[PDB]
Short mmCIF file of C-alpha atoms and ligand atoms in Angstrom, two decimals:
data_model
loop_
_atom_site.label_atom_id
_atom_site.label_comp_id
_atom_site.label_asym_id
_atom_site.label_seq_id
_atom_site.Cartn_x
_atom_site.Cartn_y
_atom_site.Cartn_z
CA UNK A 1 56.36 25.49 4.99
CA UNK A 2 56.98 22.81 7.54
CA UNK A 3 57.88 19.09 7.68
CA UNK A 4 55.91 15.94 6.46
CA UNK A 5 55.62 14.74 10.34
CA UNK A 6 53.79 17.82 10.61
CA UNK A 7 51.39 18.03 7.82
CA UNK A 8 50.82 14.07 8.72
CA UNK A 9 49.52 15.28 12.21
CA UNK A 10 48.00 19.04 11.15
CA UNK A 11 45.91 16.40 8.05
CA UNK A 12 44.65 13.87 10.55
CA UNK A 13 43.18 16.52 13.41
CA UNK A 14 41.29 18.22 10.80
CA UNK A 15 40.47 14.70 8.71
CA UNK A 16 36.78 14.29 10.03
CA UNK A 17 35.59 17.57 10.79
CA UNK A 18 32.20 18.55 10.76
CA UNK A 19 30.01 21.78 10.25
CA UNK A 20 29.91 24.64 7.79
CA UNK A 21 30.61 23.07 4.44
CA UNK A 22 29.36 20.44 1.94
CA UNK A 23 30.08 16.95 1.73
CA UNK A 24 28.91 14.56 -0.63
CA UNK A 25 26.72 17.79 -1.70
CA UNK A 26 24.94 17.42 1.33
CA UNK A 27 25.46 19.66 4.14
CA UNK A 28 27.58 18.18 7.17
CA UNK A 29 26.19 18.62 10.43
CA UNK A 30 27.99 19.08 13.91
CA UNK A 31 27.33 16.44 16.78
CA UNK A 32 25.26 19.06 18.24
CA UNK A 33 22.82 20.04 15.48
CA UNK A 34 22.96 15.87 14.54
CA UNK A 35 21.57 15.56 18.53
CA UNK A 36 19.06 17.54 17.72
CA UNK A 37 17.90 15.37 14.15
CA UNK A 38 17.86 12.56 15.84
CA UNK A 39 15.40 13.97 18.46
CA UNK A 40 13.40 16.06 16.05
CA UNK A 41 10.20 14.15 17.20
CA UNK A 42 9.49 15.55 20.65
CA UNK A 43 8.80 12.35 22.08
CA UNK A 44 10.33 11.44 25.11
CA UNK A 45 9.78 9.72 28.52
CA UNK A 46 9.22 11.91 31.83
CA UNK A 47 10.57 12.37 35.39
CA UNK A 48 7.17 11.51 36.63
CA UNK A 49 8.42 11.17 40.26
CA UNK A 50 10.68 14.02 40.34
CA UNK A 51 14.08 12.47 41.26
CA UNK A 52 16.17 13.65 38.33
CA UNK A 53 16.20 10.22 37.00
CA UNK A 54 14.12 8.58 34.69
CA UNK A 55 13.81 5.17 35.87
CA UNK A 56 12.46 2.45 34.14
CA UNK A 57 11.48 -0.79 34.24
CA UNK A 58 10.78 -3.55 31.55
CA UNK A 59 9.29 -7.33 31.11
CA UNK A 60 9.90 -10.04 29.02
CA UNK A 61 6.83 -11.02 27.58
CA UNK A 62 6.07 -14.44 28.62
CA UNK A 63 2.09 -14.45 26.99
CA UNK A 64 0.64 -12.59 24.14
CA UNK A 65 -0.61 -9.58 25.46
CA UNK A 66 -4.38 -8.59 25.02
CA UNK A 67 -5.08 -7.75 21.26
CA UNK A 68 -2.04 -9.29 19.86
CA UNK A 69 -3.77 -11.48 17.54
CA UNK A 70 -4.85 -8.22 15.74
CA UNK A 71 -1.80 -7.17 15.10
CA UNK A 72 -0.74 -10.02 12.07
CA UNK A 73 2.64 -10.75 13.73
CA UNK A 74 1.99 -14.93 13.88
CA UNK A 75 3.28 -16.56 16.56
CA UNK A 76 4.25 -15.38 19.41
CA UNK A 77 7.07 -16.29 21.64
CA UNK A 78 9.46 -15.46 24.78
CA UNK A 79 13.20 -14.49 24.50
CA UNK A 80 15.66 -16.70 24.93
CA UNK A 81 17.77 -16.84 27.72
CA UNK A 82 20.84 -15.80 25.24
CA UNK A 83 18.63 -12.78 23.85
CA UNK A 84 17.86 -11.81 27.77
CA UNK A 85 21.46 -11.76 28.28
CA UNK A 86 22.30 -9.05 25.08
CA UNK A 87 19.39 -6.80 25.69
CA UNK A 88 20.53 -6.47 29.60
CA UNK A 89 23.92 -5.45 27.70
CA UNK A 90 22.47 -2.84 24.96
CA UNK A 91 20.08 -1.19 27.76
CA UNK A 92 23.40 -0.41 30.04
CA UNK A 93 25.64 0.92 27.45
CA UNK A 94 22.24 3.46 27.38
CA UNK A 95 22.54 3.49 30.82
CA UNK A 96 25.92 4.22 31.24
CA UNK A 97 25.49 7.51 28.97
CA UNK A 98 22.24 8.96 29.75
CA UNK A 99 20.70 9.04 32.88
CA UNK A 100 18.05 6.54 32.74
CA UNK A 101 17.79 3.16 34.48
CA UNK A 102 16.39 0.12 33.98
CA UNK A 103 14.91 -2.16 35.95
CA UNK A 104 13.39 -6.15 35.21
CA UNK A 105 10.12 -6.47 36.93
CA UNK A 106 6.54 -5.76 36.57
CA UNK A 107 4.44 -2.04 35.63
CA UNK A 108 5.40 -0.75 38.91
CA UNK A 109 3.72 2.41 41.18
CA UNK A 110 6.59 4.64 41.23
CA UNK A 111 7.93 4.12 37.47
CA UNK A 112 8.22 7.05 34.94
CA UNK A 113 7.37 3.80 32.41
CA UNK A 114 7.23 0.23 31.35
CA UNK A 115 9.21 -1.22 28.63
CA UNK A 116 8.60 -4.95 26.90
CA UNK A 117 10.55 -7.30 24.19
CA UNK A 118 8.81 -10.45 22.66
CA UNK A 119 9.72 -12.12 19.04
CA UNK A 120 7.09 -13.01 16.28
CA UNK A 121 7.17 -15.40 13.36
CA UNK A 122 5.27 -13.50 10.50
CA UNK A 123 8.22 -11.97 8.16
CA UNK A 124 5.12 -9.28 7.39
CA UNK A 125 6.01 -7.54 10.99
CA UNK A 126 9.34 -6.70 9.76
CA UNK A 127 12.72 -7.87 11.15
CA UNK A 128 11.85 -5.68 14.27
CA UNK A 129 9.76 -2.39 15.12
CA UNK A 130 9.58 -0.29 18.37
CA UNK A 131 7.34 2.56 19.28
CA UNK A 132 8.38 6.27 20.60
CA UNK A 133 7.87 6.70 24.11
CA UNK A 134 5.02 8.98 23.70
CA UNK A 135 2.30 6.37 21.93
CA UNK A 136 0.30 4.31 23.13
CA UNK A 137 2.63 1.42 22.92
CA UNK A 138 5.38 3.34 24.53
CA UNK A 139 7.79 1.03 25.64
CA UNK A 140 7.64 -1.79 23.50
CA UNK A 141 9.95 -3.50 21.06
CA UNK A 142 9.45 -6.52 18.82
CA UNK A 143 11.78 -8.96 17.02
CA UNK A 144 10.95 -11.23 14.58
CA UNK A 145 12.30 -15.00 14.07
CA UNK A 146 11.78 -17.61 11.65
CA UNK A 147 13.21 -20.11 9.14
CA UNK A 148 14.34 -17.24 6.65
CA UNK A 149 15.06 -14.54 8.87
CA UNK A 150 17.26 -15.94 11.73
CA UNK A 151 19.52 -12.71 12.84
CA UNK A 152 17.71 -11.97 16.24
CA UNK A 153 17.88 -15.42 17.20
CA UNK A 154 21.63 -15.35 17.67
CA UNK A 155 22.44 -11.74 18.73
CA UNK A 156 26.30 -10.87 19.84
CA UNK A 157 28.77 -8.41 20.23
CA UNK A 158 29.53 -7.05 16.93
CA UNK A 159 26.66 -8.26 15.03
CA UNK A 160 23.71 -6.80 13.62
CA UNK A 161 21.36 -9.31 16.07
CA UNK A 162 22.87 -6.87 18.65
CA UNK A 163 22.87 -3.75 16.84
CA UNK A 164 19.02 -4.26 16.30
CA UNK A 165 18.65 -4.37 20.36
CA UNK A 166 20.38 -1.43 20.56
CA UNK A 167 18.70 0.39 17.48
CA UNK A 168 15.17 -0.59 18.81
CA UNK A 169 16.17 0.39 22.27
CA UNK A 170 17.35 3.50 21.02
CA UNK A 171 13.52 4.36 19.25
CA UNK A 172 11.90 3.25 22.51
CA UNK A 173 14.16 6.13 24.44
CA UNK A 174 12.49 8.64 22.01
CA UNK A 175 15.48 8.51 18.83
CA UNK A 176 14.24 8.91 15.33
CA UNK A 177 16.42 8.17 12.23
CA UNK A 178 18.67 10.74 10.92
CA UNK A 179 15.89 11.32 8.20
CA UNK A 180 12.50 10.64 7.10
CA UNK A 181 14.17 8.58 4.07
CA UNK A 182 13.46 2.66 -2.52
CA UNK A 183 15.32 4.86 -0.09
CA UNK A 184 19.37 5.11 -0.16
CA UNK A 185 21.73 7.64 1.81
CA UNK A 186 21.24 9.96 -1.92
CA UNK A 187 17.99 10.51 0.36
CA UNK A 188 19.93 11.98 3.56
CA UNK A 189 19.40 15.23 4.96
CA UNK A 190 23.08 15.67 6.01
CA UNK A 191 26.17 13.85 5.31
CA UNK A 192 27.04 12.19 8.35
CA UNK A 193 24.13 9.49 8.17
CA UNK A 194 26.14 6.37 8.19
CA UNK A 195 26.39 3.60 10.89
CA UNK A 196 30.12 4.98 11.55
CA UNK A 197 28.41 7.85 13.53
CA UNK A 198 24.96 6.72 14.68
CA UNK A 199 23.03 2.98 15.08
CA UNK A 200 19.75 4.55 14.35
CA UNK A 201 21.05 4.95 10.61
CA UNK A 202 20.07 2.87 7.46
CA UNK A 203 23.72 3.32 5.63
CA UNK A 204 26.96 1.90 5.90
CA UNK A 205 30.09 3.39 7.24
CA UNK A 206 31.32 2.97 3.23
CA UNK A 207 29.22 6.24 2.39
CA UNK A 208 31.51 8.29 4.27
CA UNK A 209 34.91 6.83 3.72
CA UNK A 210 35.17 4.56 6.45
CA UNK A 211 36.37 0.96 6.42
CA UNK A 212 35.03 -1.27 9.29
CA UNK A 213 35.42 -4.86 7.10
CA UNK A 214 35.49 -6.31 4.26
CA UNK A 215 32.44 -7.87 1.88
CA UNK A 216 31.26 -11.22 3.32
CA UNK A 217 31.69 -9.95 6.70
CA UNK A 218 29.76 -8.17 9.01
CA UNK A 219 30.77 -5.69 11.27
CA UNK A 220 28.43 -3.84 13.53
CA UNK A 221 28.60 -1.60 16.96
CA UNK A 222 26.97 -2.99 19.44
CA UNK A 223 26.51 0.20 21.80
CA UNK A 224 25.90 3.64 21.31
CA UNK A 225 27.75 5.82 18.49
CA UNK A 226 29.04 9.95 19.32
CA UNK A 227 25.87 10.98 18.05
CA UNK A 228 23.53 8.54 19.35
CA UNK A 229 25.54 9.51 23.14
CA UNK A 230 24.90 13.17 22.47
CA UNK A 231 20.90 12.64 21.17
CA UNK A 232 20.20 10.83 24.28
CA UNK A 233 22.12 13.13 27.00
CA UNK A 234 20.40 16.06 25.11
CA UNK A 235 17.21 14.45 26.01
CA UNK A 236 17.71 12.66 29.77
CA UNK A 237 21.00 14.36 30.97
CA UNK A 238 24.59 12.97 30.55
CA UNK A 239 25.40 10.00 33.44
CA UNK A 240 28.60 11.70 34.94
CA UNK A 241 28.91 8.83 37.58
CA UNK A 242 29.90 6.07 35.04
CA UNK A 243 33.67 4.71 35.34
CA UNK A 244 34.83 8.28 37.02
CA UNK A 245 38.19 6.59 38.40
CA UNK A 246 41.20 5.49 36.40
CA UNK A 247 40.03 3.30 33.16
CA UNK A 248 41.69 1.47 30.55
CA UNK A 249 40.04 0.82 26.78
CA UNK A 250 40.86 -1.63 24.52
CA UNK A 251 43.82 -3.92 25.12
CA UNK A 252 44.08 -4.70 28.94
CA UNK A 253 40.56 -2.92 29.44
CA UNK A 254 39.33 -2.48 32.87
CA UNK A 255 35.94 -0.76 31.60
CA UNK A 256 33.91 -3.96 31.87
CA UNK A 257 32.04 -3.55 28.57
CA UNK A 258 32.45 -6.56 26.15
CA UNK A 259 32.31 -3.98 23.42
CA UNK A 260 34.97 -1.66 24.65
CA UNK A 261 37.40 -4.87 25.20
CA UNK A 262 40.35 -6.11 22.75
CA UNK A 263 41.91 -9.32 23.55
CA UNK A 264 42.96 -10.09 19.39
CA UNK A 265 44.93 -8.17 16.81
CA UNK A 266 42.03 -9.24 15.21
CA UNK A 267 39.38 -7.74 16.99
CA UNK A 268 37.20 -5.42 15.11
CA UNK A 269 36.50 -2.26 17.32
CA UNK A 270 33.71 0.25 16.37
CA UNK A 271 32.87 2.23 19.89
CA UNK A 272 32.23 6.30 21.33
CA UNK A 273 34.16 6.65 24.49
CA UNK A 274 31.52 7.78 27.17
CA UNK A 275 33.82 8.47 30.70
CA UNK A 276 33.14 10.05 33.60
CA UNK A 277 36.47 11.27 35.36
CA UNK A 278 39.49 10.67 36.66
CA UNK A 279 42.77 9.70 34.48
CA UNK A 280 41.41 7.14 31.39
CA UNK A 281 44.24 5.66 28.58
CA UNK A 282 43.01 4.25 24.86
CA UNK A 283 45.53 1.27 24.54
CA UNK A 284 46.02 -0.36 21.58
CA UNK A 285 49.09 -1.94 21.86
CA UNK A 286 48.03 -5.40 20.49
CA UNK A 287 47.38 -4.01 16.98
CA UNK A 288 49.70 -4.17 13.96
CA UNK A 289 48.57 -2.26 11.66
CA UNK A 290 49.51 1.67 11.26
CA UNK A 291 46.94 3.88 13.70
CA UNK A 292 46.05 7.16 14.25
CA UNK A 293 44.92 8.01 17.64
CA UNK A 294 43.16 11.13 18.57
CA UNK A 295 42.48 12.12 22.00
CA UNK A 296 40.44 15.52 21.58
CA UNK A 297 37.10 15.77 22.80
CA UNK A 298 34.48 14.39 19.57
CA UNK A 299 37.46 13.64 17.56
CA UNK A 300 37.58 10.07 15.50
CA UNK A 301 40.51 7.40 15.44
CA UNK A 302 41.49 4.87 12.91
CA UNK A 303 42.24 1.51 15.35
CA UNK A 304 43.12 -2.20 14.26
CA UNK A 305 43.86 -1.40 10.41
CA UNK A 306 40.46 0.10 10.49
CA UNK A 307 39.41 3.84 9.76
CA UNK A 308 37.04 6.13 11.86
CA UNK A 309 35.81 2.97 14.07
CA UNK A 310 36.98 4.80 17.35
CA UNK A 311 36.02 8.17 18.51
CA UNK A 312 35.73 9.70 22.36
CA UNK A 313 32.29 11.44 23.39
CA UNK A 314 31.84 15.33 23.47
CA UNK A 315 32.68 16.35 26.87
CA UNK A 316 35.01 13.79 27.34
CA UNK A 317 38.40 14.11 28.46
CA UNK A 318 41.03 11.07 27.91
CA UNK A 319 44.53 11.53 29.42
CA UNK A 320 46.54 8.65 27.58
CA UNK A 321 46.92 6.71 24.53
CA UNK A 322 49.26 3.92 23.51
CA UNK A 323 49.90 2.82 20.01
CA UNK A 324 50.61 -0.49 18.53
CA UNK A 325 53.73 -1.96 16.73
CA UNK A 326 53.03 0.11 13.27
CA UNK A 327 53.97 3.24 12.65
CA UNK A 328 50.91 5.81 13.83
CA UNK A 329 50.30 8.85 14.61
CA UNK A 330 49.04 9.96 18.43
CA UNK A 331 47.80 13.46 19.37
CA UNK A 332 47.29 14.46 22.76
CA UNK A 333 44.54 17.65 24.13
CA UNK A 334 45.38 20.37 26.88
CA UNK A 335 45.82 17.95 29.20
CA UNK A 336 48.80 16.41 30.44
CA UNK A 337 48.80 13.45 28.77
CA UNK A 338 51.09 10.15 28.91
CA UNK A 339 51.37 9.32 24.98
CA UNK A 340 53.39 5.61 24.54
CA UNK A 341 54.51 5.25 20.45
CA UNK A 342 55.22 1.35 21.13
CA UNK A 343 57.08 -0.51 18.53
CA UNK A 344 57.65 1.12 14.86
CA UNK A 345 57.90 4.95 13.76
CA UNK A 346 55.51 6.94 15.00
CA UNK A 347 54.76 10.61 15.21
CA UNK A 348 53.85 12.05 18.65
CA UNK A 349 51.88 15.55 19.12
CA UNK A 350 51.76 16.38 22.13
CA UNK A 351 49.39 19.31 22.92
CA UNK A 352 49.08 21.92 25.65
CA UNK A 353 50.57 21.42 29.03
CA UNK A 354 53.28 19.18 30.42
CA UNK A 355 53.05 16.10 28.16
CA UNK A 356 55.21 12.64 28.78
CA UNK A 357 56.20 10.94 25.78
CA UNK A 358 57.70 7.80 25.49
CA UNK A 359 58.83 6.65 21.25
CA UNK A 360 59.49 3.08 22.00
CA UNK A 361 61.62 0.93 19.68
CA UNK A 362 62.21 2.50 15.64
CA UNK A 363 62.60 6.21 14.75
CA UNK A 364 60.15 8.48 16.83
CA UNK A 365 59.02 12.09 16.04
CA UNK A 366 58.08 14.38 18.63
CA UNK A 367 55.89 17.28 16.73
CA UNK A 368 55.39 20.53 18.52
CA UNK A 369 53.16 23.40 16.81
CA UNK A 370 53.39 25.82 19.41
CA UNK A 371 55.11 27.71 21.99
CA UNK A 372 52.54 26.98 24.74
CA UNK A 373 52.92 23.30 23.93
CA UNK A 374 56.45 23.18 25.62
CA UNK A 375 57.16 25.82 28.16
CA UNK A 376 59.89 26.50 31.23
CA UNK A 377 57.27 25.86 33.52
CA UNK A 378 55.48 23.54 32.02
CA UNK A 379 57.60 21.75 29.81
CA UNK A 380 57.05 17.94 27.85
CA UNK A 381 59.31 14.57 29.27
CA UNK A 382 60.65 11.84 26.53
CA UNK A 383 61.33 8.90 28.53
CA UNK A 384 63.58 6.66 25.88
CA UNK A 385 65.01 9.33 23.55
CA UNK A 386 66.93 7.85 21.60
CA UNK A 387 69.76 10.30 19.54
CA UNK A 388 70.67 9.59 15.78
CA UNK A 389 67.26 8.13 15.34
CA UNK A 390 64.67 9.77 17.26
CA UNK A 391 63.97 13.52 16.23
CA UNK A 392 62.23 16.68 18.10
CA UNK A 393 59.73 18.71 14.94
CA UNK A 394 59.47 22.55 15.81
CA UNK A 395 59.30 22.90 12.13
CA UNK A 396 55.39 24.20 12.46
CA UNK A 397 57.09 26.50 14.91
CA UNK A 398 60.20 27.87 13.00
CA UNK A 399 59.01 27.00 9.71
CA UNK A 400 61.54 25.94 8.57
CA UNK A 401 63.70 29.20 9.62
CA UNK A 402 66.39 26.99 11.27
CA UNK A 403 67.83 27.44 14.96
CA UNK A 404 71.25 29.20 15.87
CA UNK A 405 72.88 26.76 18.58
CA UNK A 406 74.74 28.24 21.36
CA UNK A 407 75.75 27.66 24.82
CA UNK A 408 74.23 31.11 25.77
CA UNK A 409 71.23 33.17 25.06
CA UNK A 410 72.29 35.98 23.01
CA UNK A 411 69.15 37.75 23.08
CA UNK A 412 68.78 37.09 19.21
CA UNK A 413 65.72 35.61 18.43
CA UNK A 414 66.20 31.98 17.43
CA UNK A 415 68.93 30.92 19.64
CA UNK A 416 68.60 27.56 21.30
CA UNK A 417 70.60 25.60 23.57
CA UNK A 418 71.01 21.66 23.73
CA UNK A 419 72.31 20.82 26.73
CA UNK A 420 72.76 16.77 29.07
CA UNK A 421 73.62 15.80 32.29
CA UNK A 422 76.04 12.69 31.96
CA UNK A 423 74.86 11.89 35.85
CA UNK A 424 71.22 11.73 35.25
CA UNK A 425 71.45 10.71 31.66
CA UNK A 426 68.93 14.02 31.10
CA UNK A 427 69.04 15.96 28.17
CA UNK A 428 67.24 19.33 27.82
CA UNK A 429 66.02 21.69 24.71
CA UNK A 430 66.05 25.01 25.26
CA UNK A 431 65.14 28.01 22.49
CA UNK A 432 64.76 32.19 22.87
CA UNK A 433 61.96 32.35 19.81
CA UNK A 434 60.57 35.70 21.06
CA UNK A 435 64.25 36.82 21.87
CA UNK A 436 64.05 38.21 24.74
CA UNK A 437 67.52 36.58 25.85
CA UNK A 438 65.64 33.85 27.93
CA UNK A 439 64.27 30.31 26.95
CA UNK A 440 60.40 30.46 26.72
CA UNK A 441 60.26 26.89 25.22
CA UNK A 442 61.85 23.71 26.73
CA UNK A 443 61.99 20.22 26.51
CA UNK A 444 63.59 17.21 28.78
CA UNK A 445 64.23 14.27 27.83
CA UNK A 446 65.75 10.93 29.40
CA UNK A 447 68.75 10.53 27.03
CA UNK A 448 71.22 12.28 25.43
CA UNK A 449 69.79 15.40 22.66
CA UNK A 450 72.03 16.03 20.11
CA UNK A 451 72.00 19.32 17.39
CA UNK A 452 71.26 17.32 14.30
CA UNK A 453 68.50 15.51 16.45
CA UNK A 454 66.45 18.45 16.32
CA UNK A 455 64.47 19.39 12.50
CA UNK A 456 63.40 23.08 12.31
CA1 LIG B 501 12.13 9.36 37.94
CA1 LIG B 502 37.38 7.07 33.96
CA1 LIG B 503 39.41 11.69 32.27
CA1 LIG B 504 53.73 2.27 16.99
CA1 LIG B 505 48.86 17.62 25.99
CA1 LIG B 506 62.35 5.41 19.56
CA1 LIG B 507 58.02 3.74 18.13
CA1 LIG B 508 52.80 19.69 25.59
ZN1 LIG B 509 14.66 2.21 13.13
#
């Protein structure tokens, strides 16, 4: 067996996995074989100008085009300037993923296409309707707005005004819904058909477990979901150029995306990570509430007292992670990662290669599950160890075997060594689990290890 700290970590990297098995008697689909659901339809724009782009432009409407009358909508009328402002902001977080462009202006000579948004009064239109890029309205998108339905006329980060934009956006691009589909998600085709994975779904994040707010409230993404990002790449080509230096998400954000920004304990996050390089951190220090933070490739978080709202795209690599003052849970990748616990007790996994882990106030755990996670040459760093309240887990390791402390490698497998440096304040961890009489696992740490730190 092994420890709770563990199970805690080993229960939360295999809590939303997908593939191969029934949920909710429906089958559960990958992110891959979702991608390919969502563009089931064939329809998609072109690279008519050969540039490996597809570049588009689009037009407010400022007139009725010709044969609008026919179409029963009522009235017809322009965006608003605050309505210009939020569909600029749903076409980039498109943008930033896939690579397509686009453009205000006119039909122009060299475009692969043409793309238009106008509102209409007459409920019988709908609350909004696009058309797949290969019709003969390709490109256009219409919202409605009236006395009883007013929730385009106010669209905003987090709401379902914005959501819309980005839904309707996302049919234009050549996205269906995750099924044909009164309809309810009993009609799905697969089990991850909720808004928690995809805007171009009809069902709530509650079908599947997740908890993004409470009743009364609303609480919507406002770009892209993991499956939505991996529909359009499939289709146009992942954007690799977008944020490839250093970025921050969340608290102290430097990605420049309202949605990806947390200034409030408050805030309500529900984003996909899309990154293109260089060394990114997820901070969520200004949260209290208990989180579980998940930095592998397609894996899902729960941030801000929340539950699946965060996840990081596939083919995404994020370096570092930094909890908030509850107790969570963080789990690094292969990388080297920096993972910061912050204030409470929290449980730290740290992953392959040289990891550097920092507990921060209350009684840390760092978890190892394998030799490769902590080697001689390549070997993890606490920062602010802190003995007779901080502890180092090989439990998934040893289970639960024990260790013999000794000063000396005896060449009996088991034997470990704690050893400090009173004149760097470093403390090491050394063990011989193969036995060969060497160490093939270490650990350093910034503060005194002692033998009853360690649980194996
Ligand atoms: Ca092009
Ligand atoms: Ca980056
Ligand atoms: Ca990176
Ligand atoms: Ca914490
Ligand atoms: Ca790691
Ligand atoms: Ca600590
Ligand atoms: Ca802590
Ligand atoms: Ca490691
Ligand atoms: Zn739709």
């Amino acid at each position: 067996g092994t420890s709770s700290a563990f199970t805690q970590i080993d229960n939360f990297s295999h809590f939303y996995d997908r593939g191969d098995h029934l949920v909710n008697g429906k089958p559960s689909f990958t992110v891959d074989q979702v991608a390919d659901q969502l563009t089931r339809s064939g329809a998609s724009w072109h690279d008519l100008n050969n540039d490996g782009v597809i570049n588009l432009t689009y037009t407010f409407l400022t007139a009725p085009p010709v044969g609008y009358a026919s179409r029963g909508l009522g009235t017809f009328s322009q965006f608003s300037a605050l309505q210009k402002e939020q569909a600029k902001l749903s076409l980039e977080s498109w943008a930033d993923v896939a690579k397509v462009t686009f453009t205000e202006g006119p039909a122009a000579r060299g475009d692969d296409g043409h793309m238009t948004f106008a509102n209409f009064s007459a409920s019988n239109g709908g609350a909004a309707f696009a058309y797949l890029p290969n019709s003969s309205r390709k490109g256009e998108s219409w919202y409605l707005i009236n006395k009883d339905y007013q929730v385009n006329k106010t669209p905003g980060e987090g709401n379902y005004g914005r959501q819309t934009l980005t839904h309707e956006i996302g049919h234009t691009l050549g996205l269906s819904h995750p099924g044909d589909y009164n309809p309810t998600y009993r009609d799905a085709v697969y089990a991850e058909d909720t808004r928690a994975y995809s805007v171009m779904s009809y069902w709530s994040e509650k079908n599947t477990g997740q908890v993004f707010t409470k009743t009364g409230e609303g609480a919507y993404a406002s770009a892209p979901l993991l499956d939505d990002i991996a529909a359009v790449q499939k289709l146009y080509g992942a954007n690799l150029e977008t944020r490839a230096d250093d970025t921050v998400y969340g608290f102290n954000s430097t990605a420049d995306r309202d949605f990806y920004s947390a200034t409030s304990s408050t805030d309500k996050l529900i984003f996909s990570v899309w990154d293109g390089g260089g060394n990114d951190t997820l901070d969520f220090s200004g949260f209290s509430q208990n989180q579980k933070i998940n930095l592998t490739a397609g894996s899902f978080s729960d941030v801000g007292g929340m539950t699946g709202n965060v996840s990081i795209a596939q083919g995404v690599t994020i370096e570092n992670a930094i909890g908030g003052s509850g107790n969570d849970l963080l789990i690094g990748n292969d990388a080297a990662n920096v993972l910061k616990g912050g204030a409470g007790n929290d449980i730290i996994y740290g992953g392959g290669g040289a990891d550097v882990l920092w507990g921060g106030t209350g009684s840390d755990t760092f978890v190892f599950g394998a030799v490769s996670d902590s080697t001689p040459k390549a070997a993890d760093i606490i920062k602010d160890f802190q003995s007779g309240f901080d502890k180092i887990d090989l439990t998934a390791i040893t289970k639960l075997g024990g260790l013999n402390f000794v000063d000396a490698f005896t060449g009996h497998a088991g034997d470990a060594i704690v050893s400090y440096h009173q004149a760097s304040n470093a403390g090491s961890l050394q063990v011989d689990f193969s036995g060969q009489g060497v160490a093939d696992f270490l650990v350093t740490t910034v503060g005194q290890v002692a033998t009853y730190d360690i649980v194996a």
